[PDB]
């Protein structure tokens, strides 16, 4: 599997918190996070941070990767997940979840009205 | 779910309810023992309050010192402890009782685990052993409307000034 | 240690309960330095309790702005509250800057607190029969001011 | 085996590994009858507050251990003046109102407590770890073996810990009564 | 054997750039580690400064409230009121020009101080009067400096404030509390 | 790195080779290194005998 | 410069290094990140009393610089200008001399 997410102490990132950060984040982008992704982060520490290495840190410096890391409830749990997973196939299959504008707003009727026409390349249709 | 606790199950037009919408008990599972005695003591207090508050209306115990009238739930308790007065008779009472638990299940309640729980193993009326988790329910659920019934008593009896049955 | 002076001639090493019995040069050298301070604190002390009876009282004002002169005040326990509060503050804080300052030592003798008040180093045996009487004087000087303090507990003051 | 701060300081700092002990092998929980690794609530499975957690409990039972001889001692003996006398405040607790604010009393105690606290804060932080937790170097009467190290460490938790919840009760029933030292009605 | 403790805080270790400098390797007391976020220079180019300023301020309030006047009418003032009055009067306007000036000079001096084009230290002006020969001589003569700044620094401190709660010319004996 | 004879706490000011207070070199702002010094000292002395 | 003795140790080397400094702050660990404003983000093993000022560098070279920008040039100049036409007026009001 992949080195740095493995025996990555608990002071770091919690276990729960590691595993909605694995989910929250494509498969792809485990091996190398991109930058300024939250993985970034805990790869950039954890291959620090550990059993075989500086098992110590200033309070200063762990002060700051403790307001770097994820705080466990900003990201997304596997319902919310779905529903983004969802919608966009809804949106990108050319159907629309049916809403209807409010008092500044919309509420969603619950509805799937199939939008592209007949031409779905053709606007009036 | 919280073990084999009864709780759930049972439990209305489901089945099972599960509620634990904080998951006090996924958090604390070795807490489940403790969580069930709580539970259930405190039904069973809470059941035995309320009907505490309607019987001393009509009959008042032989102490003689509490066979006096203006003793409602408002002013009982900070009536009755003296200067040692019946308060304390009941709470000598309660620490006797009490004792009892400790011996069954150690002076660490180590013992207490998740079907011994509330289990003072006082046992007349029940029967065979799927009654037993019939009657476990029928504990509980009445045991947690009293909980609610007496807090709405006190709560508002005191509040609006009532101090008796209709609490209102 | 049974050659770290105090056992002078009347009785030798006097440790009936034995709390130094066991060998730990560190609590003695707390214990001896407690010992030779107190000595040291009772001597002034006792000295303190028989003079301003005696004679000696100091001429002027103790609180010129409150009016006290020295000869008001009494002499022993009950003073306490006569001597201003702010005046046993002073006195609180002076004996601070010559306990743990002028006098502050470390990983040098027992009580050889360095400056004291001319810095002065003797020897010979001269040095181990005098270091022995401010001992004696010291343990001497500790009984008597407890009991001048607590008889004047149970006498009032004076004769 | 009590390393003094000026080695002990090289192995401080925001630990990031697990002793496996109950909190971080952290004196405390040693009771009469054997072991009474007490938290229900799981706050020393954050280990790496543990030794933030052991400077707090120590803290509070070192105010408490003072604030508890605090209301006995005043309702004995006071401050010779009129400003404590026991007809100007006569119950201790209400000093907080009278000695306060303008008054000066309490003012400067709040200043001076400040200044050490802002001076003292460094080794709370920094220079703190499972080790030297509440460690400020005032080790005279300590004994030398570590078992009775041990000892003392556990008897000033235990008084810290019961005059915290001492003094507790000392403000509630002292407030509730308005009485002398035995607080009870 | 471990970190270097400083003497005046002893369960904190002294801060690195307390090493080789006047006061400092002797107490090393900064526990809240100010001279660990600015630069030890400048630091002790304030202080120093901070030192003569209430020596003189000191000083010049002893001698106010014990009487010492200049000849002139106009200066018939309480210490309290002196600030006020004398800036109303003009003179203060004038003071600050001519430390003004003498400052745009310490400036300068801070300035090429700090950037190495000069050797000074950080209080040094060039002033060699009753400065001993001896290093250590100039070593302690440095220390007795601090410690006289300081302690006005304090003393000045101390008066001001007394002397504004008890209107009461400096010795503050007699007040009322 | 000399220091001036005047403000000794100043660096020597350069470009001010003997002219007439080369023994007390006093520049403490540094015009001579900003400007044509022989342009300075005509100003100084048309203003001294001015 | 200002990290004459750090001890300054790589990534690759973060359990490796103990040798501590002359001070006995732990060796640090250096991060080449790429932004230009923070170069080097320098992370701690342990507890330690490191030098880190807080204040800027700046020097007389490139603040007299910034003074010589055309901004600050015809700004200074200006307000010169302004200040001394407000003193003229304050001086010699009503021009009554003309
Ligand atoms: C203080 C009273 C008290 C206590 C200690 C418990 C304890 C418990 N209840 Mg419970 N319950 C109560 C009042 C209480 N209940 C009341 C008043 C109701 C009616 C709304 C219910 C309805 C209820 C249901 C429907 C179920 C439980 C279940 C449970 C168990 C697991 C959930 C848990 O961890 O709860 C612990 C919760 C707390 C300690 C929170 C206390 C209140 C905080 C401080 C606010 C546990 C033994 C479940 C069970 O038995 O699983 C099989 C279950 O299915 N309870
Ligand atoms: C104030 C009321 C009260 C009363 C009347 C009792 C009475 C008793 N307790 Mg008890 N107890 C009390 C409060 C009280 N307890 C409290 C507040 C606690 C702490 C929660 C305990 C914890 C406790 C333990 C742990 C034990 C007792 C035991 C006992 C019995 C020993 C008899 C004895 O020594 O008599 C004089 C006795 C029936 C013992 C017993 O019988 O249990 C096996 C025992 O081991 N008690
Ligand atoms: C604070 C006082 C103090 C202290 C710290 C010491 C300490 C010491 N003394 Mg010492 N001593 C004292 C007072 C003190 N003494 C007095 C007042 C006398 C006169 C009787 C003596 C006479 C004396 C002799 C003759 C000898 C010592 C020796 C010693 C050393 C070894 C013995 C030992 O372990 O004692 C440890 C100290 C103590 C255990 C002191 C405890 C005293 C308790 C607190 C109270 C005692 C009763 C008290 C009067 C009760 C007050 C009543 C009130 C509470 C109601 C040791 C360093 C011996 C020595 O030189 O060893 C080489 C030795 O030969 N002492
Ligand atoms: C532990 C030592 C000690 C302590 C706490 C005191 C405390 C006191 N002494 Mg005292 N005194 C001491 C040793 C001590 N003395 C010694 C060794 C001598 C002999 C020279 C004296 C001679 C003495 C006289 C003559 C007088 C006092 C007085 C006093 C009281 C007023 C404070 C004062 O002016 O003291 C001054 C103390 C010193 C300058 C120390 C030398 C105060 C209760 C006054 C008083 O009324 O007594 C109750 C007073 O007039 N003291
Ligand atoms: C304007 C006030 C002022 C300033 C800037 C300084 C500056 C300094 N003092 Mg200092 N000091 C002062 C007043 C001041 N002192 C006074 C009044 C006293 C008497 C109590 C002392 C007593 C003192 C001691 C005993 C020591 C210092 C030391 C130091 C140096 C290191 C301390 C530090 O980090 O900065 C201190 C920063 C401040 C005080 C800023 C004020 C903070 C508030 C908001 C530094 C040069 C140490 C030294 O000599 O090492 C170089 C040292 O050991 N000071
Ligand atoms: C070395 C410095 C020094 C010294 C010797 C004293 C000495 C004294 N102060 Mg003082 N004080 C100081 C610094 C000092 N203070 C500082 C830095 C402040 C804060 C700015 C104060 C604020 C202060 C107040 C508010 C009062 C004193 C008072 C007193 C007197 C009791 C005593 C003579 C009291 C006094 O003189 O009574 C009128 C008093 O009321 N002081
Ligand atoms: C070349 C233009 C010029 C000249 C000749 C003066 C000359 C004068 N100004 Mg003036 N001033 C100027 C520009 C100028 N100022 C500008 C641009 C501003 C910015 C708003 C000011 C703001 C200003 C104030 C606020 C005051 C003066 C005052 C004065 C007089 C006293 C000297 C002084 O305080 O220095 C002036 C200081 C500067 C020019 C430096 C600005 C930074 C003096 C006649 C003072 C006065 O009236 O004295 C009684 C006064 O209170 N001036
Ligand atoms: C009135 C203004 C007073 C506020 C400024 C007073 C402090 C100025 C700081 C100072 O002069 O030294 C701070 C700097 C010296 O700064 C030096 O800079 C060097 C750059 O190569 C290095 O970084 C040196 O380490 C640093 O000491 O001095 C200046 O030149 C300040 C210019 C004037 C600023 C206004
Ligand atoms: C407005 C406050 C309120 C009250 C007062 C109330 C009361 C009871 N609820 Mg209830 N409830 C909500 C709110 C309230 N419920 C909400 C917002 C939801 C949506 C999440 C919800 C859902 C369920 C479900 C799924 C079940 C359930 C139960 C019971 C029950 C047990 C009766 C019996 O079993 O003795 C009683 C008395 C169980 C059931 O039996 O319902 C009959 C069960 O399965 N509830
Ligand atoms: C040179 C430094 C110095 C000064 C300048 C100074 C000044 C005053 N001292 Mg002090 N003093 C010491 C030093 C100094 N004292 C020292 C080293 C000691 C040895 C412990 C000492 C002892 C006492 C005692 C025992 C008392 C006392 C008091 C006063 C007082 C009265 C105020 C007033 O007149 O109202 C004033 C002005 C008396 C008092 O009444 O204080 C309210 C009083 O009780 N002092
Ligand atoms: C502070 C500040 C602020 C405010 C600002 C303002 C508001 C400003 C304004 C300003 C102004 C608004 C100014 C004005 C000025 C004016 C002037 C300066 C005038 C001038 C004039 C002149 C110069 C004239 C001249 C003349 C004459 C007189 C004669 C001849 C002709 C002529 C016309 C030339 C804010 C809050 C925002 C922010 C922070 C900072």
Redesign the interface.
């Known amino acids: 599997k992949i080195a740095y997410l493995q025996d990555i ?4 990132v919690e276990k729960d918190a590691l595993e909605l950060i694995l989910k929250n984040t494509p498969k792809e982008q485990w091996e190398n996070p991109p930058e300024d992704s939250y993985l970034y982060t805990v790869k950039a520490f954890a291959e620090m ?3 075989g290495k ?9 002060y700051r990767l403790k307001m770097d890391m994820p705080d466990t409830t900003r990201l997304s749990s596997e319902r919310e997940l779905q529903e983004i997973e969802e919608y966009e196939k809804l949106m990108m299959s050319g159907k629309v979840p049916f809403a209807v504008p409010g008092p500044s707003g919309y509420f969603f009727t619950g509805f799937v009205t199939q939008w592209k026409g007949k031409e779905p390349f053709a606007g009036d249709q | 779910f919280a073990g084999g606790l009864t709780g759930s199950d049972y439990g209305g037009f489901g089945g099972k309810y599960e509620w634990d919408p904080v998951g006090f008990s996924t958090r ?1 599972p070795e ?1 489940l023992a403790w969580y069930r005695e709580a539970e259930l003591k405190h039904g069973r207090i809470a059941m035995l309050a309320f009907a505490g508050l309607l019987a001393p209306d009509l009959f008042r115990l032989p102490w003689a010192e509490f066979q006096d009238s203006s003793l409602d739930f408002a002013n009982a308790h900070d009536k009755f402890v003296a ?1 040692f007065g019946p308060m304390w008779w009941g709470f000598i009472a309660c620490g006797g009782i009490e004792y009892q638990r400790f011996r069954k299940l150690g002076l660490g309640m180590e013992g207490l685990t998740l079907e011994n729980a509330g289990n003072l193993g006082w046992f007349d009326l029940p029967k065979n052993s799927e009654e037993r988790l019939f009657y476990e329910t029928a504990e509980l659920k009445n045991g947690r409307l009293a909980m609610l019934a007496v807090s709405g008593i006190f709560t508002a009896g005191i509040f609006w000034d009532q101090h008796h049955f209709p609490f209102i | 240690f049974e050659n770290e002076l105090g056992v002078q001639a009347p009785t030798g090493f006097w440790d009936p309960l034995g709390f130094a019995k066991d060998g ?1 040069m ?2 003695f050298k ?1 214990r001896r330095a407690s010992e030779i301070k107190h000595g040291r604190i009772a001597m002034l002390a006792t000295m303190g309790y028989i003079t301003p009876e005696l004679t000696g009282k100091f001429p002027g004002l103790l609180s010129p702005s409150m009016g006290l002169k020295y000869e008001d005040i009494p002499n022993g326990l009950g003073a306490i ?1 006569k001597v ?2 702010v005046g046993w503050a002073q006195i609180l804080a002076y004996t601070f800057y010559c306990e743990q300052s002028q006098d502050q030592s470390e990983g040098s003798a027992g009580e050889a607190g360095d400056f004291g008040k001319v810095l002065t180093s003797k020897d010979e045996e001269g040095l181990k029969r005098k270091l022995n009487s401010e001992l004696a004087n010291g343990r001497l000087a500790m009984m008597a001011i407890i009991g001048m303090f607590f008889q004047d507990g149970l006498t009032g003051s004076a004769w | 085996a009590r390393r ?15 002793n496996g002990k109950f909190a971080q092998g952290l004196v405390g929980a040693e009771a009469a009858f054997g072991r009474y690794e007490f938290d ?3 706050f020393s499975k954050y ?2 507050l543990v030794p933030w957690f052991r400077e707090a409990e120590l803290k509070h039972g070192r105010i408490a251990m003072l604030a508890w001889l605090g209301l006995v001692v005043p309702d004995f003996v006071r ?3 009129e400003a404590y006398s026991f007809e100007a405040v006569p119950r201790v607790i209400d000093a907080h109102d009278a000695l306060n604010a303008d008054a000066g009393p309490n003012f400067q105690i709040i200043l001076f407590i400040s200044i050490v606290e ?6 709370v ?5 499972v080790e030297t937790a509440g ?3 005032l080790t ?1 009467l300590f004994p ?1 073996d570590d078992e009775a190290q041990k000892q003392m460490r556990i008897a000033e938790l235990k008084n810290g810990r019961l005059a915290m919840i001492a003094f507790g009760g000392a403000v509630t029933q002292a407030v509730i009564t308005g009485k002398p030292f035995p607080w009870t ?1 | ?3 270097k ?1 400083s003497k005046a ?5 002294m801060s690195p750039a307390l090493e080789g400098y006047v006061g400092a390797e002797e107490e090393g007391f900064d ?3 100010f001279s660990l976020a600015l630069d030890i220079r400048w630091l002790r180019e304030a202080e120093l400064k901070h030192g003569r300023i209430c020596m003189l301020a000191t000083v010049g309030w002893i001698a106010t409230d014990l009487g010492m006047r200049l000849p002139g009418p106009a200066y018939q003032v309480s210490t309290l009121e002196a600030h006020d009055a004398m800036v109303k009067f003009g003179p203060m306007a004038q003071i600050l020009i001519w430390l003004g000036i003498i400052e745009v000079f310490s400036f300068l001096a801070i300035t090429n101080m700090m950037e190495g084009t000069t050797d000074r230290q950080p209080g040094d002006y060039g002033l060699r009067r009753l400065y001993p020969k001896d290093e250590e001589g100039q070593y302690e003569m440095q220390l007795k400096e601090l410690r006289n700044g300081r302690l006005a620094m304090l003393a000045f401190s101390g008066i001001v404030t007394t002397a504004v709660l008890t209107g009461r010319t400096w010795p503050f004996x007699x007040x009322x509390x | 790195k000399e220091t001036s004879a005047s403000v000794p706490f100043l660096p020597k000011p350069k470009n001010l080779a003997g002219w007439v207070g080369g023994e007390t070199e006093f520049d403490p702002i540094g015009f001579s290194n900003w400007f044509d010094m022989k342009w300075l000292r005509e100003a100084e002395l048309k203003h001294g005998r001015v | 410069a200002e990290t004459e003795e750090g001890l300054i140790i790589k990534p690759e080397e973060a359990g490796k290094i103990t040798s ?1 400094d002359k001070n ?1 702050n ?1 060796p640090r660990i250096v991060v080449k990140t790429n932004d230009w404003d923070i170069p080097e983000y320098q992370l ?6 490191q030098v880190s000022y807080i204040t800027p560098v700046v020097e007389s070279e490139d603040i007299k610089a910034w003074l010589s920008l055309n901004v600050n040039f015809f700004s200074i100049i200006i307000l010169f200008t302004v200040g001394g036409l407000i003193e003229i007026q304050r001086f010699f009001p009503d021009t009554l001399y003309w």
Do not use: Q
């Open positions: 102490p608990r002071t770091i941070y550990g059993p500086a098992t110590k840190m200033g309070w200063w410096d762990y | 604390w807490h200067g | 730990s560190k609590a707390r509250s201003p509060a | 003094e701060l000026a080695v002990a300081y090289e192995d401080a700092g925001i630990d990031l590994m697990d229900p609530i799981g280990t790496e401050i010779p003046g802002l001076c003292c804060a460094k080794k932080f920094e220079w703190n770890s460690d400020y170097n005279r030398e009605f | 054997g471990g970190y403790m805080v002893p369960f904190l270790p526990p809240m580690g | 501590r006995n732990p701690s093993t342990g507890a330690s009393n």
